[PDB]
């Protein structure tokens, strides 16, 4: 998991957020993200 040191919200944070993993959940229960489509 990548991390940017700087942050407008402050201290330090990993870049990925709740919305991305929500989209992953949606694509899994679709039954258009992939692992590669998160990599790009």
């Amino acid at each position: 998991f990548i991390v940017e040191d700087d942050e407008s919200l402050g201290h330090k944070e990993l870049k990925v957020r709740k919305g991305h993993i929500a989209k992953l959940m949606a694509t899994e229960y679709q039954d258009e993200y992939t692992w590669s489509s998160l990599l790009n």
Partner: peptide
Amino acid sequence: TNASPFIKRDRMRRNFLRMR
């Protein structure tokens, strides 16, 4: 505390169905 001994998934799916 709740301490999370067990978890749920499709309920949170439906929560995001209402969130989106």
